[PDB]
């Protein structure tokens, strides 16, 4: 047999096109799944992961920390219009809230 080239690579991806394919096929989304479908879905999953993790590391640096934690993920997911629309009905454990105090309540 010729050497096994992982599809993630054949694709230029870190994400597991293989597992994505199993999950689509064994996951009853339909009777038949193309190769294209796994590739594309894996890519989209990688992109969103990248965006979130990037914003989260930005937040972590802003707070002079080396380690991404839940609160960081949360503040990232809330400061972007697009990620906050994608995850607008999601609760993140140990995330906390964004700091917000109404104007009328502020000292006058």
């Amino acid at each position: 047999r010729a050497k096994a080239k992982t599809r993630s690579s054949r694709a230029g991806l870190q994400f597991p096109v293989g597992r994505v394919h199993r999950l689509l096929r064994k996951g009853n989304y339909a009777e038949r799944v193309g190769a294209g479908a796994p590739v594309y879905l894996a890519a989209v999953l990688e992109y969103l992961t990248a965006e979130i993790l990037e914003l989260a590391g930005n937040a972590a640096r802003d707070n002079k920390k080396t380690r991404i934690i839940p609160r960081h993920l949360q503040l990232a997911i809330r400061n972007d219009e697009e990620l906050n629309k994608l995850l607008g009905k999601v609760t993140i454990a140990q995330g906390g809230v964004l700091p917000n105090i109404q104007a009328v309540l502020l000292p006058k």
Binding site: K89, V90, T91, I92, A93, V97, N100, Q102, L105
Partner: protein, 77 residues
């Protein structure tokens, strides 16, 4: 009568996190009512999944499923 174990201070802290400056004293008993109704809805579904699975123990997944079923997805479990 365990509901009053959700203390006036506990409710106060949650109102503070929610940006509330002053709290009328009737809020505490409303908050208990609201919380109890919410917990009943989630726990009923969690127990429903638990029974289906033929388990006697409610698992973290049963709660996560119950929350997702109610449009309150909980990340972290």
């Amino acid at each position: 009568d365990n509901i009053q174990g959700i203390t006036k201070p506990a409710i106060r802290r949650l109102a503070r996190r929610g940006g509330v400056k002053r709290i009328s004293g009737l809020i505490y008993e409303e908050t208990r009512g609201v919380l109890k109704v919410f917990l009943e809805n989630v726990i009923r579904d969690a127990v429903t999944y638990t029974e289906h699975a033929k388990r006697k123990t409610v698992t973290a997944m049963d709660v996560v499923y119950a929350l997702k079923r109610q449009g309150r997805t909980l990340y972290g479990f």
